[PDB]
Amino acid sequence: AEYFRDEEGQDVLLFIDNIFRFTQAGSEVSALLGRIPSAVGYQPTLATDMGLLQERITTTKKGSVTSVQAVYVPADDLTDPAPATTFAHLDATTVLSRGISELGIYPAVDPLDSKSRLLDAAVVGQEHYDVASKVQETLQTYKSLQDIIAILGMDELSEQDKLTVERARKIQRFLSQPFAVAEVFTGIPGKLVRLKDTVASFKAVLEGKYDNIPEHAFYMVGGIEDVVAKAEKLAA
Amino acid sequence: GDRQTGKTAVALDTILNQKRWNNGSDESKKLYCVYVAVGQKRSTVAQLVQTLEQHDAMKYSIIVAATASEAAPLQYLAPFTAASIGEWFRDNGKHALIVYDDLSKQAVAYRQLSLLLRRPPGREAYPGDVFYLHSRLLERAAKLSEKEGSGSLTALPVIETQGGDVSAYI
Amino acid sequence: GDRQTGKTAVALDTILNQKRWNNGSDESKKLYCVYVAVGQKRSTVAQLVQTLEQHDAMKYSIIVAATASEAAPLQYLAPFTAASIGEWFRDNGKHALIVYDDLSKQAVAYRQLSLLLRRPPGREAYPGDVFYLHSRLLERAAKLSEKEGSGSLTALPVIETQGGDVSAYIPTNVISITDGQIFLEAELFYKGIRPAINVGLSVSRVGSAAQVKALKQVAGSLKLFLAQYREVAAFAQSDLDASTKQTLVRGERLTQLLKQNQYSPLATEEQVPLIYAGVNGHLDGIELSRIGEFESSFLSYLKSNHNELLTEIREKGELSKELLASLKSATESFVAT
Amino acid sequence: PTNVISITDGQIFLEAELFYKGIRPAINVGLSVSRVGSAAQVKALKQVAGSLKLFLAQYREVAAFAQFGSDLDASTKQTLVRGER
Amino acid sequence: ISYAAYLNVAAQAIRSTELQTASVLNRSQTDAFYTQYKNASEPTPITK
Amino acid sequence: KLQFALPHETLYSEVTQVNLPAKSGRIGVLANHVPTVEQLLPGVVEVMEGSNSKKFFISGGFATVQPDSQLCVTAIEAPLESFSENIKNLLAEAKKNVSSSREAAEAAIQVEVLENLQSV
Amino acid sequence: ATLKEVEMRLKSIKNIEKITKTMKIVASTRLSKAEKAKISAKKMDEAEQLFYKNAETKNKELIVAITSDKGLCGSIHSQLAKAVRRHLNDQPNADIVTIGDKIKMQLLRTHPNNIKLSINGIGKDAPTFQESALIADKLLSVMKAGTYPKISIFYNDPVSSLSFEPSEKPIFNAKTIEQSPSFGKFEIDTDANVPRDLFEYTLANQMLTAMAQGYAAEISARRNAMDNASKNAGDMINRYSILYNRTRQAVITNELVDIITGASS
């Protein structure tokens, strides 16, 4: 990766699979070396090995290596030291869920469990942040609202509340990208939507300009431009 | 508190507030603040440094760095060395402050060292002299008797508690 | 799964079904089974052997035996040695099934070796490189490339849960390596559900990729129905909603249906009909006690009346709408009687 | 404790919570057994205390149920009242 | 005989088409007891 | 208007003529009628809203012309068609029952009801 | 040990969550029937109330109360108990007839003299006219209800589908009917003993309605309570989960240390 970054000056993206099995491998080598297995078995050199590895993953003045790593939590014990040490090195976490995939939303991202530390009013812009925050608040309120709204009845929603429910369900559908690799796999042409147009799309939805286009005309539909077409097809 | 709850930010705000006081001409209003970055990513520190230099707070402050990459004995020696600089200020009779961020990662460093010296593990595998390290470090931070100078060295050691269950040895 | 709850019994059922395919000439249908008895009493294995002889399964069976008396070095090498035998069949392009039973006793033997060799023991006092042993063993099971000749060596490792513990070091490692799990459950055993498999905690990472197309067609519904039955299971204990109650009727009948008298496997060409009936919900109209009698009777009714259908299901291996139509008619007719 | 338990002919567990509950000396007779039966027990006391065990055992079950505070039948409340005294 | 006893009895008799909804039949026949309390003191709970 | 209300049901709780069987014989109400209170006996009832008429068998109740012309019948559940043979068989048993046993009164109400049923 | 004792207790909490969920659902099922009934009953009552209003009703004494034998259906039992006690300050010498074991027990403590009649075999069943009629009949015979020219009944008005307020109303005696002035703006002479019939009749009609209102409030309260319980159980699950996880790690660490210490020698 570094040959690409340093010696070909090009941005890279390096996937790693399970870092649990990275840890397990390291733990074994420690034990083989006869060194005292540190707490919860893990090697005493657990921290340092990650430290070297994930500081060779950085933005140099000539390139930047991005790395996507997979964290196989040990029985979902985030409490365990090996995940904790990993999370310290990690900057963002993308938390795919199967519930989301079951809502037919591809990407499978669980939006209330995906967080980055580069999400800020400064780092990604105030506008971007505000748009994100509103959408997040919308989703956050929507989920919580759906808990007793579903049970009690959808009529229990106020005009404002169902404005939010409508917007939320429209957003929820709007999230799904029929993306290019899975053009075949879902069967629906891909959508690669540029960053500027992503912000723009959510601003408009926040202003509820497409709160006249039903929620299922955004299902498996890309950005704002795309749902102009789909709006037309919905009518036609 | 818990990891990256803006863990860094709390300390940063103190340093920032003590810009007006520190940019005073009164030597009794001079804090000389040291940020010891232990077990922290060199990138993150560089962003922090840039933040500090944006608020031009760097000119009254020192950064000592012992990043995650940097080896465990260096990490072990990082708080002790930093405190010496603080004592020079202290022994100017001038007020100082030192933030040991994260002293919890220093504990892990001393743990590593102890284990690698094949010295017996203590509770939670942190050696029994983990206490000794911390007590020696912390009690070297003081505002000396007025005769010996009014040089403070205020300590804010930043502990990253996993689980937030503070009934934990470290 | 749960300790000696006929863990070996669950395994043995498969071996018996391999007789049916074995009888057939095709060597893709000749899976040459290997049961690898690790740390097992000679009497217990004698009973196994005797049972195997009774079902004439010995004529493709191999019993690799490292008995309880047989020492820990033999036990350590016992799955590895067995695997090598498997390579010969596989290399010949044939297929075979190796059942490693149980790696839990293999682990202990390795523990005995390591501790005695004074090597530092890993987590839960089981050697540190026990993972390395298991990973080597369990990755030898492979469906080979067509290029390097299509062969296979199916494997089914058996792990004995120490009081149902699945968080234990030896289970956790193995769970990661394996492509599926089957998780036996004590409540189910007690509730007379034999097999006592808890299908919620059973998973397959190969799943539907292999299985008869016919059986796939008539069992998508089954997954969904059972899913509801599980959720609405706890609603079984008063004054209950009609919707839930309908689920309970369909679901309970299904639960009885998946009971099978152990050491008796069923022919797929008749498995497809039984599930089909359930899919057509005609079993909703059959009393729980009478499910069992119904089942055998339905099979006999199909055997006399619609053995054209049975042969069609078998040979086509797929179900045409016309075949499902005729099958439904047969089910209706039987259900009426 | 494990080693001793095997060696001995009885265990006489005292429960701390029951100390606080007001049995001082405390007891915890669910974890107290003497499997050498009524041997070396005075004959009179053997006769009288014959169903003392049954009452207490029933009391133990009943008391647990009573804590859940479900609508109790009179038979359970006979036990409960008897047990308490 | 009490007026409300009279109507009750009439309703009960009238649910004797001959075949009627279960809820009607149940609403015309439910078991109960009356525990009179003489004081504390109390005549025994007995079928109302 | 009329409000005809049962405990378990409700009927008319506009109704231009109502014909009721009462302790005052039989009463017919159209528009304003005197603001009477009469206990209704077990009855064969006709209720007409307009000319359209629906006929009810009622286990008795109470009748009250409210002084605002809101007729209010409150009565205990019996419909005519729902009641309307088994009771006649039952009555034979109940008559026997009068010999042995309040039950005498019960069977007495039942015969009154049977006669009234026979009327339909 | 710790780990297992945590785990069994956590299993208890899990079972509790499940049960409190289940109970809430079954309560909802029952609630539907309760509400359905309550409309029909209330309609009948309203027609009588039209009489009492227009009549200008012009209202030892009785206190009647309604709760169920069973508990765990809101604070129905004890909020009503407190409010009975308040109205037992309002009439110390009143004879309390308690319909329901839970209200029976609490009041029985405050005055056992005042407990005169009590009724069992009602609480587990939905309100029914047959019951109401019999209770009324016994009230007249046993308590000589008409002698006490004030009657008051307590029940739970189901204020909102999420609420219940214990409520009371006064049953209108034959004395009440008698001294109602605009009674005379309803025609009767002396042909029937309309006070003595209507009194009996409204004793039951009012009582049935009160029971229906009460039952609906009770079952709704039971649903509400059992819902809030499920939430509380979840929190306890989470708390024991953290304890379980930490406890598991600590045991592992302690065991490892012992082995290591042995190995070191």
mmCIF file with all atom_site columns, N, CA and C in Angstrom, chain C residues 212-259:
data_model
loop_
_atom_site.group_PDB
_atom_site.id
_atom_site.type_symbol
_atom_site.label_atom_id
_atom_site.label_alt_id
_atom_site.label_comp_id
_atom_site.label_asym_id
_atom_site.label_entity_id
_atom_site.label_seq_id
_atom_site.pdbx_PDB_ins_code
_atom_site.Cartn_x
_atom_site.Cartn_y
_atom_site.Cartn_z
_atom_site.occupancy
_atom_site.B_iso_or_equiv
_atom_site.pdbx_formal_charge
_atom_site.auth_seq_id
_atom_site.auth_comp_id
_atom_site.auth_asym_id
_atom_site.auth_atom_id
_atom_site.pdbx_PDB_model_num
ATOM 1   N N  . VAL C 1 212 ? -31.785 -29.748 -2.870 1.00 0.00 ? 212 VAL C N  1
ATOM 2   C CA . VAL C 1 212 ? -32.658 -29.992 -3.985 1.00 0.00 ? 212 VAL C CA 1
ATOM 3   C C  . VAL C 1 212 ? -33.494 -28.770 -4.253 1.00 0.00 ? 212 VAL C C  1
ATOM 4   N N  . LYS C 1 213 ? -33.614 -28.427 -5.557 1.00 0.00 ? 213 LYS C N  1
ATOM 5   C CA . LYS C 1 213 ? -34.312 -27.280 -6.071 1.00 0.00 ? 213 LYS C CA 1
ATOM 6   C C  . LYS C 1 213 ? -35.756 -27.402 -5.726 1.00 0.00 ? 213 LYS C C  1
ATOM 7   N N  . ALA C 1 214 ? -36.281 -28.644 -5.819 1.00 0.00 ? 214 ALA C N  1
ATOM 8   C CA . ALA C 1 214 ? -37.638 -28.984 -5.510 1.00 0.00 ? 214 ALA C CA 1
ATOM 9   C C  . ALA C 1 214 ? -37.909 -28.659 -4.076 1.00 0.00 ? 214 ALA C C  1
ATOM 10  N N  . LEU C 1 215 ? -36.979 -29.074 -3.185 1.00 0.00 ? 215 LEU C N  1
ATOM 11  C CA . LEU C 1 215 ? -37.123 -28.923 -1.766 1.00 0.00 ? 215 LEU C CA 1
ATOM 12  C C  . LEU C 1 215 ? -36.955 -27.491 -1.385 1.00 0.00 ? 215 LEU C C  1
ATOM 13  N N  . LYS C 1 216 ? -36.169 -26.728 -2.174 1.00 0.00 ? 216 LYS C N  1
ATOM 14  C CA . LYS C 1 216 ? -36.008 -25.318 -1.980 1.00 0.00 ? 216 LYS C CA 1
ATOM 15  C C  . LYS C 1 216 ? -37.306 -24.633 -2.234 1.00 0.00 ? 216 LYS C C  1
ATOM 16  N N  . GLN C 1 217 ? -38.020 -25.010 -3.319 1.00 0.00 ? 217 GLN C N  1
ATOM 17  C CA . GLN C 1 217 ? -39.245 -24.368 -3.712 1.00 0.00 ? 217 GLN C CA 1
ATOM 18  C C  . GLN C 1 217 ? -40.274 -24.468 -2.630 1.00 0.00 ? 217 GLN C C  1
ATOM 19  N N  . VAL C 1 218 ? -40.403 -25.665 -2.026 1.00 0.00 ? 218 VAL C N  1
ATOM 20  C CA . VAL C 1 218 ? -41.463 -25.919 -1.095 1.00 0.00 ? 218 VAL C CA 1
ATOM 21  C C  . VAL C 1 218 ? -40.985 -25.693 0.306  1.00 0.00 ? 218 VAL C C  1
ATOM 22  N N  . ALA C 1 219 ? -39.883 -24.947 0.544  1.00 0.00 ? 219 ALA C N  1
ATOM 23  C CA . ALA C 1 219 ? -39.452 -24.760 1.912  1.00 0.00 ? 219 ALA C CA 1
ATOM 24  C C  . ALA C 1 219 ? -38.983 -23.368 2.157  1.00 0.00 ? 219 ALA C C  1
ATOM 25  N N  . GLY C 1 220 ? -39.245 -22.415 1.235  1.00 0.00 ? 220 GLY C N  1
ATOM 26  C CA . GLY C 1 220 ? -39.024 -21.017 1.540  1.00 0.00 ? 220 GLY C CA 1
ATOM 27  C C  . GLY C 1 220 ? -40.035 -20.558 2.541  1.00 0.00 ? 220 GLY C C  1
ATOM 28  N N  . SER C 1 221 ? -41.280 -21.029 2.327  1.00 0.00 ? 221 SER C N  1
ATOM 29  C CA . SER C 1 221 ? -42.429 -20.744 3.136  1.00 0.00 ? 221 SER C CA 1
ATOM 30  C C  . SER C 1 221 ? -42.189 -21.237 4.529  1.00 0.00 ? 221 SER C C  1
ATOM 31  N N  . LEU C 1 222 ? -41.579 -22.440 4.634  1.00 0.00 ? 222 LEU C N  1
ATOM 32  C CA . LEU C 1 222 ? -41.366 -23.148 5.867  1.00 0.00 ? 222 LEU C CA 1
ATOM 33  C C  . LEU C 1 222 ? -40.506 -22.362 6.806  1.00 0.00 ? 222 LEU C C  1
ATOM 34  N N  . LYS C 1 223 ? -39.480 -21.670 6.270  1.00 0.00 ? 223 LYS C N  1
ATOM 35  C CA . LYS C 1 223 ? -38.596 -20.856 7.057  1.00 0.00 ? 223 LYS C CA 1
ATOM 36  C C  . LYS C 1 223 ? -39.339 -19.712 7.668  1.00 0.00 ? 223 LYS C C  1
ATOM 37  N N  . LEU C 1 224 ? -40.191 -19.052 6.857  1.00 0.00 ? 224 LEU C N  1
ATOM 38  C CA . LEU C 1 224 ? -40.934 -17.902 7.288  1.00 0.00 ? 224 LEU C CA 1
ATOM 39  C C  . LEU C 1 224 ? -41.986 -18.279 8.285  1.00 0.00 ? 224 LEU C C  1
ATOM 40  N N  . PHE C 1 225 ? -42.693 -19.412 8.077  1.00 0.00 ? 225 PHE C N  1
ATOM 41  C CA . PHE C 1 225 ? -43.761 -19.847 8.945  1.00 0.00 ? 225 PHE C CA 1
ATOM 42  C C  . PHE C 1 225 ? -43.238 -20.135 10.313 1.00 0.00 ? 225 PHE C C  1
ATOM 43  N N  . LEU C 1 226 ? -42.081 -20.830 10.361 1.00 0.00 ? 226 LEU C N  1
ATOM 44  C CA . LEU C 1 226 ? -41.443 -21.266 11.573 1.00 0.00 ? 226 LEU C CA 1
ATOM 45  C C  . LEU C 1 226 ? -40.907 -20.099 12.319 1.00 0.00 ? 226 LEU C C  1
ATOM 46  N N  . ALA C 1 227 ? -40.508 -19.045 11.575 1.00 0.00 ? 227 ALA C N  1
ATOM 47  C CA . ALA C 1 227 ? -39.976 -17.842 12.145 1.00 0.00 ? 227 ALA C CA 1
ATOM 48  C C  . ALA C 1 227 ? -41.032 -17.178 12.958 1.00 0.00 ? 227 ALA C C  1
ATOM 49  N N  . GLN C 1 228 ? -42.268 -17.102 12.412 1.00 0.00 ? 228 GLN C N  1
ATOM 50  C CA . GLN C 1 228 ? -43.380 -16.532 13.115 1.00 0.00 ? 228 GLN C CA 1
ATOM 51  C C  . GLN C 1 228 ? -43.722 -17.379 14.302 1.00 0.00 ? 228 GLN C C  1
ATOM 52  N N  . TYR C 1 229 ? -43.679 -18.726 14.164 1.00 0.00 ? 229 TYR C N  1
ATOM 53  C CA . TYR C 1 229 ? -44.049 -19.636 15.220 1.00 0.00 ? 229 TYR C CA 1
ATOM 54  C C  . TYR C 1 229 ? -43.159 -19.474 16.420 1.00 0.00 ? 229 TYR C C  1
ATOM 55  N N  . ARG C 1 230 ? -41.860 -19.194 16.184 1.00 0.00 ? 230 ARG C N  1
ATOM 56  C CA . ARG C 1 230 ? -40.895 -18.971 17.225 1.00 0.00 ? 230 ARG C CA 1
ATOM 57  C C  . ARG C 1 230 ? -41.197 -17.727 17.995 1.00 0.00 ? 230 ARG C C  1
ATOM 58  N N  . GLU C 1 231 ? -41.520 -16.630 17.291 1.00 0.00 ? 231 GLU C N  1
ATOM 59  C CA . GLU C 1 231 ? -41.795 -15.363 17.912 1.00 0.00 ? 231 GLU C CA 1
ATOM 60  C C  . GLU C 1 231 ? -43.077 -15.412 18.684 1.00 0.00 ? 231 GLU C C  1
ATOM 61  N N  . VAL C 1 232 ? -44.079 -16.107 18.119 1.00 0.00 ? 232 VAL C N  1
ATOM 62  C CA . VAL C 1 232 ? -45.391 -16.207 18.680 1.00 0.00 ? 232 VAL C CA 1
ATOM 63  C C  . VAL C 1 232 ? -45.415 -17.403 19.593 1.00 0.00 ? 232 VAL C C  1
ATOM 64  N N  . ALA C 1 233 ? -44.248 -18.056 19.815 1.00 0.00 ? 233 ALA C N  1
ATOM 65  C CA . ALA C 1 233 ? -44.138 -19.163 20.727 1.00 0.00 ? 233 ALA C CA 1
ATOM 66  C C  . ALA C 1 233 ? -44.437 -18.719 22.118 1.00 0.00 ? 233 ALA C C  1
ATOM 67  N N  . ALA C 1 234 ? -43.889 -17.555 22.534 1.00 0.00 ? 234 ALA C N  1
ATOM 68  C CA . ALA C 1 234 ? -44.026 -17.135 23.903 1.00 0.00 ? 234 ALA C CA 1
ATOM 69  C C  . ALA C 1 234 ? -45.417 -16.660 24.200 1.00 0.00 ? 234 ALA C C  1
ATOM 70  N N  . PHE C 1 235 ? -46.150 -16.161 23.179 1.00 0.00 ? 235 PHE C N  1
ATOM 71  C CA . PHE C 1 235 ? -47.570 -15.916 23.268 1.00 0.00 ? 235 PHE C CA 1
ATOM 72  C C  . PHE C 1 235 ? -48.441 -17.138 23.461 1.00 0.00 ? 235 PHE C C  1
ATOM 73  N N  . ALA C 1 236 ? -47.881 -18.353 23.676 1.00 0.00 ? 236 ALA C N  1
ATOM 74  C CA . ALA C 1 236 ? -48.676 -19.556 23.779 1.00 0.00 ? 236 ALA C CA 1
ATOM 75  C C  . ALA C 1 236 ? -49.252 -19.725 25.154 1.00 0.00 ? 236 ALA C C  1
ATOM 76  N N  . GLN C 1 237 ? -48.610 -19.134 26.182 1.00 0.00 ? 237 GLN C N  1
ATOM 77  C CA . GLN C 1 237 ? -49.129 -19.180 27.525 1.00 0.00 ? 237 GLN C CA 1
ATOM 78  C C  . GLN C 1 237 ? -49.832 -17.840 27.758 1.00 0.00 ? 237 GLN C C  1
ATOM 79  N N  . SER C 1 238 ? -53.577 -18.156 26.818 1.00 0.00 ? 238 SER C N  1
ATOM 80  C CA . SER C 1 238 ? -54.596 -17.364 27.554 1.00 0.00 ? 238 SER C CA 1
ATOM 81  C C  . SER C 1 238 ? -55.639 -16.910 26.560 1.00 0.00 ? 238 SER C C  1
ATOM 82  N N  . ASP C 1 239 ? -56.021 -15.610 26.576 1.00 0.00 ? 239 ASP C N  1
ATOM 83  C CA . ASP C 1 239 ? -56.984 -15.058 25.655 1.00 0.00 ? 239 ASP C CA 1
ATOM 84  C C  . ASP C 1 239 ? -56.143 -14.457 24.574 1.00 0.00 ? 239 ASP C C  1
ATOM 85  N N  . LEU C 1 240 ? -56.083 -15.138 23.407 1.00 0.00 ? 240 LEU C N  1
ATOM 86  C CA . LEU C 1 240 ? -55.063 -14.908 22.413 1.00 0.00 ? 240 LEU C CA 1
ATOM 87  C C  . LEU C 1 240 ? -55.737 -14.459 21.160 1.00 0.00 ? 240 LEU C C  1
ATOM 88  N N  . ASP C 1 241 ? -55.064 -13.535 20.432 1.00 0.00 ? 241 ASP C N  1
ATOM 89  C CA . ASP C 1 241 ? -55.479 -13.006 19.152 1.00 0.00 ? 241 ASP C CA 1
ATOM 90  C C  . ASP C 1 241 ? -55.588 -14.092 18.126 1.00 0.00 ? 241 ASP C C  1
ATOM 91  N N  . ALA C 1 242 ? -56.571 -13.946 17.214 1.00 0.00 ? 242 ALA C N  1
ATOM 92  C CA . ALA C 1 242 ? -56.885 -14.923 16.204 1.00 0.00 ? 242 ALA C CA 1
ATOM 93  C C  . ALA C 1 242 ? -55.728 -15.140 15.280 1.00 0.00 ? 242 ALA C C  1
ATOM 94  N N  . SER C 1 243 ? -55.011 -14.045 14.939 1.00 0.00 ? 243 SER C N  1
ATOM 95  C CA . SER C 1 243 ? -53.869 -14.093 14.066 1.00 0.00 ? 243 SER C CA 1
ATOM 96  C C  . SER C 1 243 ? -52.775 -14.928 14.657 1.00 0.00 ? 243 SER C C  1
ATOM 97  N N  . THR C 1 244 ? -52.492 -14.716 15.966 1.00 0.00 ? 244 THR C N  1
ATOM 98  C CA . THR C 1 244 ? -51.481 -15.446 16.685 1.00 0.00 ? 244 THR C CA 1
ATOM 99  C C  . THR C 1 244 ? -51.879 -16.885 16.779 1.00 0.00 ? 244 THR C C  1
ATOM 100 N N  . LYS C 1 245 ? -53.178 -17.138 17.015 1.00 0.00 ? 245 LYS C N  1
ATOM 101 C CA . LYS C 1 245 ? -53.728 -18.451 17.192 1.00 0.00 ? 245 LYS C CA 1
ATOM 102 C C  . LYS C 1 245 ? -53.658 -19.272 15.938 1.00 0.00 ? 245 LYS C C  1
ATOM 103 N N  . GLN C 1 246 ? -53.813 -18.630 14.760 1.00 0.00 ? 246 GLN C N  1
ATOM 104 C CA . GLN C 1 246 ? -53.669 -19.288 13.489 1.00 0.00 ? 246 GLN C CA 1
ATOM 105 C C  . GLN C 1 246 ? -52.255 -19.742 13.314 1.00 0.00 ? 246 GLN C C  1
ATOM 106 N N  . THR C 1 247 ? -51.288 -18.875 13.705 1.00 0.00 ? 247 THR C N  1
ATOM 107 C CA . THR C 1 247 ? -49.867 -19.123 13.596 1.00 0.00 ? 247 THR C CA 1
ATOM 108 C C  . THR C 1 247 ? -49.528 -20.320 14.426 1.00 0.00 ? 247 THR C C  1
ATOM 109 N N  . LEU C 1 248 ? -50.113 -20.389 15.639 1.00 0.00 ? 248 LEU C N  1
ATOM 110 C CA . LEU C 1 248 ? -49.881 -21.411 16.617 1.00 0.00 ? 248 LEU C CA 1
ATOM 111 C C  . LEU C 1 248 ? -50.338 -22.733 16.096 1.00 0.00 ? 248 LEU C C  1
ATOM 112 N N  . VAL C 1 249 ? -51.491 -22.774 15.394 1.00 0.00 ? 249 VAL C N  1
ATOM 113 C CA . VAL C 1 249 ? -51.980 -23.998 14.818 1.00 0.00 ? 249 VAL C CA 1
ATOM 114 C C  . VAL C 1 249 ? -51.047 -24.491 13.753 1.00 0.00 ? 249 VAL C C  1
ATOM 115 N N  . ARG C 1 250 ? -50.586 -23.615 12.833 1.00 0.00 ? 250 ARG C N  1
ATOM 116 C CA . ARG C 1 250 ? -49.735 -24.058 11.754 1.00 0.00 ? 250 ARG C CA 1
ATOM 117 C C  . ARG C 1 250 ? -48.390 -24.479 12.271 1.00 0.00 ? 250 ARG C C  1
ATOM 118 N N  . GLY C 1 251 ? -47.852 -23.662 13.185 1.00 0.00 ? 251 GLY C N  1
ATOM 119 C CA . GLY C 1 251 ? -46.571 -23.789 13.803 1.00 0.00 ? 251 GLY C CA 1
ATOM 120 C C  . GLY C 1 251 ? -46.416 -24.991 14.659 1.00 0.00 ? 251 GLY C C  1
ATOM 121 N N  . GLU C 1 252 ? -47.432 -25.308 15.492 1.00 0.00 ? 252 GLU C N  1
ATOM 122 C CA . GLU C 1 252 ? -47.378 -26.458 16.358 1.00 0.00 ? 252 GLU C CA 1
ATOM 123 C C  . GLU C 1 252 ? -47.368 -27.720 15.561 1.00 0.00 ? 252 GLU C C  1
ATOM 124 N N  . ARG C 1 253 ? -48.196 -27.798 14.491 1.00 0.00 ? 253 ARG C N  1
ATOM 125 C CA . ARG C 1 253 ? -48.231 -28.974 13.654 1.00 0.00 ? 253 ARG C CA 1
ATOM 126 C C  . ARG C 1 253 ? -46.905 -29.213 12.986 1.00 0.00 ? 253 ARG C C  1
ATOM 127 N N  . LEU C 1 254 ? -46.228 -28.131 12.542 1.00 0.00 ? 254 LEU C N  1
ATOM 128 C CA . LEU C 1 254 ? -44.904 -28.196 11.981 1.00 0.00 ? 254 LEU C CA 1
ATOM 129 C C  . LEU C 1 254 ? -43.900 -28.725 12.959 1.00 0.00 ? 254 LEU C C  1
ATOM 130 N N  . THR C 1 255 ? -43.965 -28.293 14.236 1.00 0.00 ? 255 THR C N  1
ATOM 131 C CA . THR C 1 255 ? -43.021 -28.703 15.249 1.00 0.00 ? 255 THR C CA 1
ATOM 132 C C  . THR C 1 255 ? -43.098 -30.187 15.464 1.00 0.00 ? 255 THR C C  1
ATOM 133 N N  . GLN C 1 256 ? -44.331 -30.739 15.475 1.00 0.00 ? 256 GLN C N  1
ATOM 134 C CA . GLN C 1 256 ? -44.531 -32.160 15.565 1.00 0.00 ? 256 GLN C CA 1
ATOM 135 C C  . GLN C 1 256 ? -43.993 -32.860 14.349 1.00 0.00 ? 256 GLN C C  1
ATOM 136 N N  . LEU C 1 257 ? -44.172 -32.257 13.152 1.00 0.00 ? 257 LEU C N  1
ATOM 137 C CA . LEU C 1 257 ? -43.759 -32.829 11.894 1.00 0.00 ? 257 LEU C CA 1
ATOM 138 C C  . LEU C 1 257 ? -42.277 -33.019 11.793 1.00 0.00 ? 257 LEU C C  1
ATOM 139 N N  . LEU C 1 258 ? -41.481 -32.102 12.378 1.00 0.00 ? 258 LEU C N  1
ATOM 140 C CA . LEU C 1 258 ? -40.049 -32.201 12.270 1.00 0.00 ? 258 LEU C CA 1
ATOM 141 C C  . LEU C 1 258 ? -39.482 -33.167 13.274 1.00 0.00 ? 258 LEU C C  1
ATOM 142 N N  . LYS C 1 259 ? -40.324 -33.781 14.144 1.00 0.00 ? 259 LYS C N  1
ATOM 143 C CA . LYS C 1 259 ? -39.907 -34.917 14.927 1.00 0.00 ? 259 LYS C CA 1
ATOM 144 C C  . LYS C 1 259 ? -39.722 -36.082 14.002 1.00 0.00 ? 259 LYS C C  1
#
